[PDB]
Amino acid sequence: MASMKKKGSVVIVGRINLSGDTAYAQQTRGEEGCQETSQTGRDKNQVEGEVQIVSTATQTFLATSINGVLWTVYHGAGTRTIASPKGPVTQMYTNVDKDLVGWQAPQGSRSLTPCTCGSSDLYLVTRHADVIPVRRRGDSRGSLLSPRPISYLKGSSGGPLLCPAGHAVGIFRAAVSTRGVAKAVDFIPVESLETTMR
Numbered sequence: 001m002a003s004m005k006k007k008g009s010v011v012i013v014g015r016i017n018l019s020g021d022t023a024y025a026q027q028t029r030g031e032e033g034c035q036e037t038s039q040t041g042r043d044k045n046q047v048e049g050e051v052q053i054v055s056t057a058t059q060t061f062l063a064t065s066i067n068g069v070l071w072t073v074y075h076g077a078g079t080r081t082i083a084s085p086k087g088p089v090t091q092m093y094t095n096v097d098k099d100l101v102g103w104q105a106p107q108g109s110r111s112l113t114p115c116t117c118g119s120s121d122l123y124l125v126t127r128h129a130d131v132i133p134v135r136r137r138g139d140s141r142g143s144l145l146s147p148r149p150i151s152y153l154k155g156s157s158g159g160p161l162l163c164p165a166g167h168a169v170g171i172f173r174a175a176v177s178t179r180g181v182a183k184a185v186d187f188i189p190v191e192s193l194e195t196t197m198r
């Protein structure tokens with residue numbers, strides 16, 4: 001018992017910058033700082049923007065702020081705390097059945113507004129800051145207008161699907177692939193987030 005180890009915190013290591021005319025990834029913390037921050041849970045770095053790049057000791061993926069909550073996937077974060085300036089912060093939402101978790105949005109982040117447009121022309125933002133057109137095909141599915149090898153999408157779970165006006169429509173969860181080629185994406189609809197927020 002005395003030697004039982006503790007899982008580290010999720011650490012914000014960068015962001016997908018969407019503030020200007022050009023989307024691009026920025027790293028804000030390197031690997032050594034990330035490992036140390038994961039162990040302490042103390043992250044004094046300034047946070048900006050809507051889409052964060054996040055890491056554990058073993059995985060890297062995305063997290064998206066909507067309605068003052070930073071949301072990501074359970075298959076990436078598990079039940080982990082997130083590092084913050086005052087120490088680790090416990091999840092405020094956890095739903096393994098939806099593959100969804102959330103923490104209070106960090107100070108300095110900006111939140112996306114849930115979409116109320118009813119529009120099916122969407123855009124997926126990847127961890128490499130690609131903005132991919134996606135046609136909505138159901139409550140939780142959308143098709144890529146140009147298929148991609150699944151390599152292209154690996155590490156983008158937790159990122160947003162957006163409407164033409166930049167509202168959040170969903171959180172990217174899984175790639176739908178045949179023979180390694182992604183022709184569609186599965187996502188957590190923002191309404192499911194809004195319900196989880198009871």
Ligand SMILES: CC(C)(C)OC(=O)N[C@H]1CCCCC/C=C\[C@@H]2C[C@@]2(C(=O)NS(=O)(=O)C2CC2)NC(=O)[C@@H]2C[C@@H](Oc3nc4ccccc4nc3-c3cccs3)CN2C1=O
Binds near residue numbers: 061077175
């Ligand atoms: C069968 C269907 C049609 C749904 O499609 C698939 O399942 N296709 C699979 C193909 C996997 C091959 C790689 C695809 C590329 C990118 C993928 C975008 C990402 C991604 O980037 N991940 S990541 O960032 O690299 C990682 C964080 C570091 N997503 C995944 O890889 C998802 C994880 C897991 O699904 C779950 N795993 C778990 C594990 C524990 C607890 C709950 C749980 N619930 C889950 C779900 C409930 C509903 C849908 S999934 C399977 N994934 C899929 O995509």
Ligand SMILES: [Zn+2]
Binds near residue numbers: 117118163166
């Ligand atoms: Zn909208």
